[PDB]
Design a binder for this molecule. Structure first.
Ligand SMILES: CCCCCCCC/C=C/CCCCCCCC(=O)O[C@@H](COC(=O)CCCCCCCCCCCCCCC)COP(=O)([O-])OCC[N+](C)(C)C
Ligand SMILES: CCCCCCCC/C=C/CCCCCCCC(=O)O[C@@H](COC(=O)CCCCCCCCCCCCCCC)COP(=O)([O-])OCC[N+](C)(C)C
Ligand SMILES: CCCCCCCC/C=C/CCCCCCCC(=O)O[C@@H](COC(=O)CCCCCCCCCCCCCCC)COP(=O)([O-])OCC[N+](C)(C)C
Ligand SMILES: CCCCCCCC/C=C/CCCCCCCC(=O)O[C@@H](COC(=O)CCCCCCCCCCCCCCC)COP(=O)([O-])OCC[N+](C)(C)C
Ligand SMILES: CCCCCCCC/C=C/CCCCCCCC(=O)O[C@@H](COC(=O)CCCCCCCCCCCCCCC)COP(=O)([O-])OCC[N+](C)(C)C
Ligand SMILES: CCCCCCCC/C=C\CCCCCCCC(=O)O[C@@H](COC(=O)CCCCCCCCCCCCCCC)COP(=O)([O-])OCC[N+](C)(C)C
Ligand SMILES: CCCCCCCC/C=C\CCCCCCCC(=O)O[C@@H](COC(=O)CCCCCCCCCCCCCCC)COP(=O)([O-])OCC[N+](C)(C)C
Ligand SMILES: CCCCCCCC/C=C\CCCCCCCC(=O)O[C@@H](COC(=O)CCCCCCCCCCCCCCC)COP(=O)([O-])OCC[N+](C)(C)C
Ligand SMILES: CCCCCCCC/C=C\CCCCCCCC(=O)O[C@@H](COC(=O)CCCCCCCCCCCCCCC)COP(=O)([O-])OCC[N+](C)(C)C
Ligand SMILES: CCCCCCCC/C=C\CCCCCCCC(=O)O[C@@H](COC(=O)CCCCCCCCCCCCCCC)COP(=O)([O-])OCC[N+](C)(C)C
Ligand SMILES: N#Cc1ccc(COC[C@H]2O[C@@H](n3c(NCc4ccc(Cl)c(Cl)c4)nc4c(N)ncnc43)[C@H](O)[C@@H]2O)cc1
Ligand SMILES: C[C@@H]1CC[C@@]2(OC1)O[C@H]1C[C@H]3[C@@H]4CC=C5C[C@@H](OCCC(CO)CO)CC[C@]5(C)[C@H]4CC[C@]3(C)[C@H]1[C@@H]2C
Ligand SMILES: CC(C)CCC[C@@H](C)[C@H]1CC[C@H]2[C@@H]3CC=C4C[C@@H](O)CC[C@]4(C)[C@H]3CC[C@]12C
Lengths: 1105, 82, 91, 92
């Protein structure tokens, strides 16, 4: 059948015949005009009932010959005289002519259909989610008329309550009723076109206009906007989405609302609002001016079980007014003030135009309506009575329906709306259960409702109390939220492929992920021997610092808006933000590498650079208060983050703007100094004091007070615990600035000897200089090995991956390996004893030296970049050599575009040779540098250096070369100039930052380097080696200073927020917004006074007269 | 079109056909030029623009092989029938 | 244009028509060119398509690449991209 | 406190509220026992709770222990003396 609609649903229709009102009107012979006009009680014209079996009776007049017990018929049984069959009217309305052509959809079923079928196709076939509210508007359906404010404002709520809860407004469909009125609101608001309210509006197929347009299976409908003035049949209202057109099996008749609009309401209220939550979906009944039947329908919902509440409105019309009217008269519900118990019946008369026996009947309905005034409300637009019908609608389900504040809250949680609960659940004198607050936080966290996290943690829910192993452990094991589907990937990696069926994530696992994401040696609390024990055993089952544990959860499961909220709370704010920048930055890298669908990497890279920018912006807010303590923040051992440091995390995340802040540079200077006060002393004195040891005793050092913010090793702390002469040397030699200027002056004494060897002739055996040269390199190489093995990194494969990601550690490797190819072939050779440079082995080993030298002059840029002016220019020559590879290839086509024709045109007898690989590249390269070879152009000329190259075709090379240089000296070499000139600021700005970042890795390498330079370093090696076989820094604070620093961080965080809030509220754009929104409101509250004042005037013009 | 006038209903051949043949508006006086070009010089006295013509203009303006609905064998038939 | 459907397609046809009338106006002159009037009219539509695309590329980059390629069937079995290339609409 | 929060004093060294009360009518007295010891003092809005929480926004407290639970009086014995004793000191 291919269509689940008609495969399941069916259409009912009359199959027998029952003449409705047999008596013909006129046209003397009845027989034809009778049958031609006299409809069946079925519905339509009797002749129209095709359904062949009836049509073999329509042939004469009907079924059941003429009279033949004319009384007997008169029921039209809607199962026997009425069989059903598969649907042939179900499709999609297009609303022909609609101004962007708002769409909807329809089906056509039999009212005996069971609600299981309507629900399942609604959520499967029509493919929707179960709502979170059902606003079934059982109001009055007579195209009625209102005042603008209530036409306008009342929608401002009704729409808003339904878009904020994904509702399904369930009207009567028809455009001559309650449907007609919500559409007036649905358009005035427009819902900023989206998946807005998914209105259903069930109605029949009997009273419907242009039924024939939308006949056919799964068929688009040319349904047309007929505002024909009379049109007994009615159009469906415009803005309504999905429709149902239940065909009773009869034109004209009513009834195909309640048979389903009853069942649907209950049947949705039978279903669970959400996976986590376990309530019933709420039903709320709204009333626009009702009627004699509605005012009983109102009562029915009051009388249902579950007691579905109702919302009426003062000033839409007859019923909503009267139900609101008696709500004023009746007090307690049970009363009816007897002084006016038919005086309302005086009003019940005038409004409707009722009679008497129904007047008490309406009044009767009014009584049971009031008997529960509890679960029913009124909308008094004329006053300030719970404004904006939203609150009333949303609230009304909570006040009336007896449910605990838990059962209240959990609904508000499902509806992503605190403002209700903030003022209607979290109200004075409330009976808050002991664990309901806790059990709600379980739901708000998993469902990603930060706003309720805020609400609960405000009203009092300590994360310290609500954070056990089992609670936390499953927060990972949930799909009921914006889950990261990548977390399960990182886990199955660190398990080395293992992947059980369901796999309860254990906290061992999350640890091993963070150990893998944060890298290096970051040991989480989740993996330590203590925690491993207690986890295999289950307030000791709690965590000390919860918001350090949830901040990980909020970031692993990619829940940013939760992460930031959980960041501002708690403590260690700078630290947490830099961990997050590492985690996100670390997940992004794993996403790219291990792809399955959309990377979400730029989503994470944006999430890192958000946290990673708070730290920078939190630092400057601390550097501007007390620059000293703000340098202690970057260095204190954290103790909740694996004994790491607020700066070693930034360096781990390659977060250049932090290490390149002016606090991470004034500290690094303060360590570069050491115990020296080099603002008083001068670099002249250090260079002297090195080559003059006893001049160390005239250098002005720093007190232990001036080295509080400066992390130290254990030994320097001891020399400041346990200045004397002996401690006045140790503080010099173990200074980074001294270890530098004590290596430079060695290296600059290495390059002056090596240079001497390279230039001066070299006999069989190395001269005294060349032995010293080998000594440096050898001992220097050892310094480069021990620099690797004793590196911070863990697995050797990672130690052998950071030290080779450095331009100068490769260039050392190439230069230390190469010099020992050189010393090998220089010392290891036969030495002809007649002339050197007749042993190509000897020759070779030298030319290794004379070329390796370039590695060693170029290294002075590692020394020259120490300066704040020279560093950048050194860090630009990388970014200019890189970003011009493509111009320079274009400059090599042109070179061979010219070199091949010229060597072909000028030397036309050349056998194959390697000279044909130089001479097509040689002179055309030296032309770029202004050497024109002017007496070799026009080789046939009289002034030629090449008078033998004159031959056929050699008059062409002056032209080719003219064309050549115009390209290689005017177009292309001045394209470079324009390249550099326009890429200068944006590389100079960076190269400062790449420099200020690399200053970290440089200083903190001398702060672990031997005192003694690479000719004599071998002593300090043997000392450390000999003793390590026989026998980094820390910011040592006292327990009192740990508090003072802790106080510093707290205040500095609090200001960061308090300043930005004012920088936003003080800005003009924001004051225009408020001013605008006030001045809107002002216009309203003035003009209403302007009205009212105009009533107090026309009053007093007539009261006394 | 808001109060309800379906363009699907108000768009016949005769209606549409004369909307080109009007001077009662901000007319482009160039349309008559492109037409007399694609006719290869021909230019009758009054020249009721036919929808064959507008097609051959669009085939000429859009270039390449853009065939309009107005020139296909089907539409040519029905236009010579109404 | 805003009414109806196939909005991206229509705008790129317009950019071609106006761009094509402008060229014929310049060539075959009789009085004031009205060409810069048309060239402004093309680059208005022709800029809606660009600004309609980015609004679709930022939602689901996949489907927004299917928009550029589905046979149109109301515009001579052409394509929302083969029309841009026809109008030399570089952006 | 309702005022102290509505204003927030743009977090600073703002008002340094004292709010002297006893240790007798106080809630969760046992949480904050011990010498110079951080206290896990908790926000108990238990609906009945004859014992009462200290209000939130109040800074420095004094919890004069008369030597009796339940009893009152450990406001006036000092909140008298303090007032006079500060009024005895020079403003600057
Ligand atoms: C931190 C990581 C980066 C640094 C890496 C550090 C490691 C560096 C890596 C080095 C690897 C490079 C290769 C080894 C060098 C020799 C190669 C060679 O050609 O030898 C030659 C000499 O061979 C001899 O035996 C005579 C000279 C003594 C050898 C001294 C070289 C080894 C020193 C290494 C000290 C390194 C340890 C430094 C301290 C740690 C063999 O040829 P020949 O005999 O001359 O030929 C005679 C031909 N004829 C007879 C025809 C004339
Ligand atoms: C007597 C003399 C004889 C020799 C004369 C001839 C000398 C010839 C001259 C040679 C030029 C030498 C200088 C170039 C140094 C490399 C630059 C660099 O570090 O790039 C990048 C290294 O990127 C990486 O991925 C790291 C591993 C790459 C190693 C490159 C080896 C080049 C060897 C060449 C062999 C030449 C041997 C030739 C001789 C046999 C920069 O870092 P990164 O990209 O960020 O690193 C990855 C880090 N990340 C993954 C965290 C992002
Ligand atoms: C026919 C002749 C043709 C020309 C010949 C060749 C000449 C040219 C040289 C060729 C040498 C080969 C290395 C090229 C550099 C690659 C890397 C780069 O571009 O920049 C990278 C680093 O860059 C560096 O670390 C080094 C930059 C090159 C310096 C060149 C030496 C200058 C002095 C020589 C004096 C010699 C004088 C004596 C000569 C006897 C940086 O790039 P980035 O954009 O920041 O990318 C991010 C980096 N990241 C991954 C680490 C995060
Ligand atoms: C990664 C970036 C790539 C970098 C660029 C590409 C790499 C560079 C590639 C260069 C091409 C290769 C050249 C060498 C070929 C062998 C030469 C030979 O054997 O003999 C030659 C000797 O002369 C020499 O050997 C001199 C060295 C070559 C000149 C290099 C020019 C560099 C400038 C241009 C560089 C710009 C390149 C522009 C791009 C095309 C000539 O033959 P012969 O007969 O032996 O000599 C006469 C001796 N006799 C008189 C005594 C008889
Ligand atoms: C611009 C203002 C300045 C003046 C303008 C005046 C224009 C008037 C020009 C007139 C040119 C014709 C007269 C010369 C021929 C006479 C014979 C002769 O000497 O033949 C010589 C060939 O030399 C040539 O063929 C010369 C080059 C001819 C082409 C000129 C350029 C085209 C115009 C520009 C367009 C360029 C396109 C630009 C592209 C961007 C041979 O003699 P040889 O050299 O001794 O070699 C023989 C030796 N052997 C026999 C031993 C082997
Ligand atoms: C702050 C500045 C940097 C600090 C300095 C860096 C620290 C380390 C500094 C220098 C290392 C010193 C080593 C020298 C040992 C040998 C000395 C010598 O001359 O021997 C030799 C003695 O004889 P000769 O007079 O040379 O005559 C030739 C002898 N021959 C015949 C045996 C060939
Ligand atoms: C590895 C790092 C070690 C640390 C370095 C220090 C240790 C190195 C220490 C001593 C090394 C030398 C001792 C051995 C004997 C030397 C003999 C000699 O060469 O004499 C020559 C001088 O010397 C030179 O010309 C070369 C050495 C000095 C200049 C180059 C290094 C200076 C920098 C390093 C120091 C300052 C640093 C400045 C920058 C901060 C003189 O003789 P000549 O030139 O042949 O001519 C004589 C005339 N005649 C030939 C006609 C008779
Ligand atoms: C040799 C093994 C090669 C294998 C690779 C080893 C790599 C380097 C390893 C280790 C580091 C360096 C030490 C070894 C190399 C230098 C010493 C040397 O070899 O002297 C030679 C003697 O030469 C002299 O007596 C005159 C000149 C050198 C003496 C001054 C040494 C300078 C280094 C001191 C300052 C730095 C140390 C500071 C720490 C306190 C002995 O060697 P030889 O070959 O027998 O000499 C030729 C024959 N002859 C003896 C007749 C003259
Ligand atoms: C660990 C890495 C190791 C690297 C490779 C180790 C290579 C070790 C290689 C060789 C060791 C043994 C030496 C002898 C070789 C055989 C030839 C021979 O004996 O003599 C011939 C020498 O012919 C030559 O070509 C000599 C030079 C070649 C070496 C080039 C190495 C390049 C290194 C690149 C830089 C690497 C940088 C790495 C950067 C990361 C001829 O001479 P003869 O017959 O002896 O007598 C004179 C002849 N006559 C009579 C004609 C005048
Ligand atoms: C043995 C007897 C004694 C004499 C020997 C020793 C002579 C002197 C040695 C070298 C010459 C330069 C000396 C200037 C140093 C000034 C001080 C200074 O500020 O240094 C700076 C650079 O520090 C460096 O070390 C820069 C690199 C110099 C050593 C490497 C050689 C490069 C120059 C040769 C290249 C070949 C060129 C060839 C030219 C022919 C560091 O400090 P800063 O940048 O001011 O820091 C700013 C912020 N702060 C101040 C707040 C901290
Ligand atoms: N204080 C301080 C300080 C001391 C030394 C240095 C020198 O730089 C050392 C490191 O600087 C690295 N580096 C460099 N080095 C620049 C450079 C190195 C060598 C030469 Cl010959 C030249 Cl033409 C330029 N450029 C980098 C870049 N663009 N991005 C990331 N890293 C870069 C390089 O790996 C090199 O090992 C920088 C700062
Ligand atoms: C994209 C670019 C197009 C241009 C180009 O790069 C790529 O294409 C390359 C092809 C090269 C030639 C290939 C083979 C040989 C044979 C050899 O024969 C030795 C014989 C004898 C010596 O006496 C042995 O004993 C001599 C050299 C020669 C001609 C090459 C020259 C360079 C050429 C032309 C290169 C040129 C730069
Ligand atoms: C082709 C071979 C056989 C001949 C020699 C090739 C030339 C081009 C080689 C020999 C030595 C080389 C230099 C050796 C060391 C360095 C330092 C490095 O930081 C940049 C590259 C640089 C500057 C090299 C550039 C290329 C170089 C000059």
């Amino acid at each position: 059948q291919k269509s689940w609609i008609e495969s399941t649903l069916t259409k009912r229709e009359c199959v027998y015949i029952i003449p409705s009102s047999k008596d013909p009107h006129r046209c003397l012979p009845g027989c034809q005009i009778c049958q031609q006009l006299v409809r069946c009680f079925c519905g339509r014209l009797v002749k129209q009932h095709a359904c062949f079996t009836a049509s073999l009776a329509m042939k004469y007049s009907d079924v059941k010959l003429g009279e033949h017990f004319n009384q007997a018929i008169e029921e039209w049984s809607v199962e026997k005289h009425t069989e059903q069959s598969p649907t042939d009217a179900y499709g999609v309305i297009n609303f022909q002519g609609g101004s962007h052509s708002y769409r909807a959809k329809y089906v056509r079923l039999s009212y005996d259909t069971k609600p299981e079928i309507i629900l399942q196709l609604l959520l499967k076939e029509w493919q929707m989610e179960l709502p979170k509210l059902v606003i079934s508007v059982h109001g009055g359906m007579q195209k009625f008329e209102l005042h603008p404010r209530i036409k306008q404002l009342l929608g401002k709520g009704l729409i808003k309550a339904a878009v904020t809860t994904g509702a399904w407004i369930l009207t009567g469909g028809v455009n001559t009723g309650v449907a007609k009125h919500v559409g007036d609101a649905l358009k005035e608001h427009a819902s900023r076109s989206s998946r807005k309210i998914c209105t259903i509006g069930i109605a029949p197929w009997g009273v419907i206009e242009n039924r024939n347009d939308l006949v056919g299976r799964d068929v688009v409908a040319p349904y047309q906007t007929l505002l024909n003035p009379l049109s007994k049949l009615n159009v469906l209202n415009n803005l309504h989405s999905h429709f149902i057109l239940v065909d009773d099996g009869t034109v004209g008749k009513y009834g195909a609302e309640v048979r389903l609009r009853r069942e649907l309401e209950k049947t949705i209220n039978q279903q669970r609002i959400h996976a986590r939550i376990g309530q019933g979906v709420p039903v709320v009944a709204l009333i626009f001016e009702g009627g004699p039947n509605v005012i009983l329908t109102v009562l029915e919902y009051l009388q249902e079980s579950p007691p579905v509440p109702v919302v009426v409105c003062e000033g839409t019309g007859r019923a909503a007014d009267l139900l609101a009217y008696i709500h004023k008269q009746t007090e307690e519900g049970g009363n009816l003030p007897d002084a006016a118990e038919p005086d309302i019946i005086s009003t019940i008369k005038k409004t409707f135009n009722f009679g008497q026996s129904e007047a008490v009947h309406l009044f009767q309905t009014m009584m049971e309506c009031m008997k529960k005034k509890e679960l029913i409300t009124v909308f008094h637009i004329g006053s300030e009575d719970h404004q904006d019908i939203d609150v009333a609608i949303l609230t009304a389900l909570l006040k009336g329906t007896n449910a605990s504040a838990f059962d209240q809250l959990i609904l508000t949680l499902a509806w992503d709306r605190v403002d209700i609960a903030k003022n209607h659940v979290f109200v004075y004198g409330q009976q808050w259960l002991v664990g309901s607050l806790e059990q709600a936080m379980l739901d708000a966290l998993v469902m990603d409702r930060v706003s309720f996290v805020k609400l609960l943690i405000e009203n009092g829910v300590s994360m310290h109390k609500f954070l056990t192993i089992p609670r936390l452990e499953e927060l990972y094991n949930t799909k009921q939220g914006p889950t990261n589907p990548m977390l399960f990937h990182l886990i199955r990696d660190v398990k080395q492929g293992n992947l059980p069926p369901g796999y309860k994530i254990t906290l061992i696992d999350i640890g091993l992920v963070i150990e893998y994401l944060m890298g290096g040696t970051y040991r989480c609390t989740y993996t330590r021997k203590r925690f491993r024990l207690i986890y295999n055993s289950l307030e000791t089952k709690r965590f000390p610092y919860p918001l350090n544990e949830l901040l990980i959860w909020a970031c692993l499961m990619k829940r940013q808006v939760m992460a930031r909220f959980l960041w501002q709370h708690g403590e260690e704010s700078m630290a947490k933000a830099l961990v997050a920048c590492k985690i996100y930055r670390s997940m992004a890298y794993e996403a790219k590498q291990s792809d399955l669908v959309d990377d979400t990497s730029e989503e994470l890279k944006q999430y890192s650079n958000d946290f990673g920018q708070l730290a920078v912006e939190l630092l400057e807010q601390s550097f501007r208060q007390d620059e000293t303590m703000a340098m202690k923040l970057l260095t204190y051992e954290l103790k909740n983050w694996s004994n790491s440091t607020c700066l070693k995390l930034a360096v781990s995340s390659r977060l250049r703007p932090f290490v390149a802040h002016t606090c991470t540079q004034m500290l690094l200077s303060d360590m570069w100094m050491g115990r020296l006060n080099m603002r008083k002393n001068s670099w002249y004195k250090v260079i002297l004091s090195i080559l003059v040891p006893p001049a160390i005793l005239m250098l002005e050092y720093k007190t232990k007070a001036e080295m509080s913010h400066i992390p130290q090793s254990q030994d320097a702390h001891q020399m400041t615990m346990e200045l004397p002469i002996t401690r006045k040397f140790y503080a010099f030699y173990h200074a980074p600035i001294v270890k530098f200027w004590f290596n430079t002056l060695a290296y600059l004494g290495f390059l002056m000897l090596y240079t001497f060897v390279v230039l001066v002739k070299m006999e069989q055996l190395p001269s005294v200089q060349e032995w010293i040269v080998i000594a440096y390199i050898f001992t220097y190489a050892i310094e480069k090995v021990r620099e690797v093995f004793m590196s911070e990194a863990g697995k050797i494969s990672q130690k052998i991956k950071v030290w080779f990601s450095d331009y100068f550690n490769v260039s050392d490797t190439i230069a230390i390996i190469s010099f020992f190819v050189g010393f090998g072939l220089r010392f290891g050779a036969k030495w002809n004893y007649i002339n050197a440079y007749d042993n190509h082995v000897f020759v070779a080993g030298r030319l290794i030296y004379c070329l390796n030298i370039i590695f060693w002059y170029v290294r002075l840029l590692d020394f020259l970049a120490v300066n704040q002016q020279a560093g950048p220019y050194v860090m630009m020559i990388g970014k200019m050599v890189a970003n011009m590879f493509y111009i320079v290839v274009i400059m090599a086509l042109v070179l061979l575009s010219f070199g091949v024709p010229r060597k072909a045109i000028l030397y036309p007898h050349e056998e194959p040779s390697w000279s044909l690989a130089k001479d097509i590249v040689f002179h055309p390269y030296w032309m770029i540098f202004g050497e024109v070879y002017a007496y070799e152009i026009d080789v046939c000329a009289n002034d030629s250096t090449l008078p033998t190259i004159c031959g056929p075709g050699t008059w062409l090379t002056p032209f080719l070369q003219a064309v050549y240089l115009f390209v290689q000296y005017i177009i292309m070499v001045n394209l470079l100039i324009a390249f550099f000139n326009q890429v200068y600021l944006q590389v100079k700005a960076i190269s400062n930052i790449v420099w200020k970042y690399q200053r970290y890795h440089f200083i903190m390498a001398y702060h672990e380097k031997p005192v003694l330079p690479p000719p004599l370093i071998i002593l300090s090696h043997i000392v450390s080696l000999f003793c390590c076989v026989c026998k980094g820094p820390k910011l040592f604070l006292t327990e009192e200073d740990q508090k003072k620093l802790h106080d510093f961080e707290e205040q500095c965080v609090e200001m960061y927020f308090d300043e930005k809030d004012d920088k936003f509220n003080s800005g003009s754009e924001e004051r225009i917004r408020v001013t605008f929104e006030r001045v809107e409101q002002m216009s309203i509250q003035i003009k209403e006074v302007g009205d009212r004042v105009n009533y107090i005037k026309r009053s007093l013009q007539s009261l006394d007269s």
